């Protein structure tokens, strides 16, 4: 009289738990929210092909607790049903592989993250969430839809919406092993004298303010904390790349001069992102659609230079 199947119930989708289900009730009434790849079946009954699938839950007792935090390392109640909801869109996208590289096709605003997912494959960038590694690596061999929908729920950001390359790498840059990169800076101010300031982590990869690597080593004019104008230059950099960023403006890119950037056309509200790399000549990706060409000038908001360790030979007279 009372009908069952047995399902697993998962969080990661590696440690499964067996559980048997009532077909009289929804998966709902039985677990909360529960989805069945993204697709959210809280609202329907247990139905006889479902028997041996996995079911993705919310980590609502002590076990699937820890077992979210060790593969997600977050503890955000939200996030597990955010990665689903965004993965029941991402699943739908496809993946071309081009000029070497997983790249999406366009749809759902998706442009930012395209560009995002194919600067990941050229940068070194280790990450330390196993689900994050997991779904890198699944998505350079071109099932891209776990990494796509992580970066989203990572990120608390949901399908549709416009999104900004820098601001995603940013986020991503927090859950990567960066803590041996290391940026000294020296802010010269003519009257109060030298300021060295020792950046690390996610700080020491990223600059917003130029797009060009070489124009961070001469220097950069900025107001010091009194008012005046002062002079900014990198003094040390230990790291593998760089991110360098800015509003978007014409700039020239010579192959063989930096690693890959981001275009942006479209305004400030609604743009248009695509991917400029340095191979053996000039690539621009975007989405599915290849195009190259030996120069480029274009509008452009970031540049990833590669590196290894660079110390300045500046050298100020000043003081302090
Ligand atoms: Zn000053």
Sequence with gaps: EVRTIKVFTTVDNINLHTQVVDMSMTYGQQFGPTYLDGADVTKIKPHNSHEGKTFYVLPNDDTLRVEAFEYYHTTDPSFLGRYMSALNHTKKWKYPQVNGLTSIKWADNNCYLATALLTLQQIELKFNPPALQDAYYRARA???????????????????????????????????????????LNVVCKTCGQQQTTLKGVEAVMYM??????????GVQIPCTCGKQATKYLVQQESPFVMMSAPPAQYELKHGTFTCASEYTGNYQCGHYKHITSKETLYCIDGALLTKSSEYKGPITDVFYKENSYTTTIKPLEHH
Aim: with cysteine.
């Design 209 to 218: 303010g130029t797009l060009s690597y070489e124009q961070f080593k001469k």
């Design 142 to 184: 071109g099932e891209a839809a776990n990494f796509c929908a992580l970066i989203l729920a990572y990120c608390n950001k949901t399908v549709g919406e416009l999104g900004d390359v820098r601001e995603t790498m940013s986020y991503l840059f927090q859950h990567a092993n960066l803590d041996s990169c290391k940026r000294v």
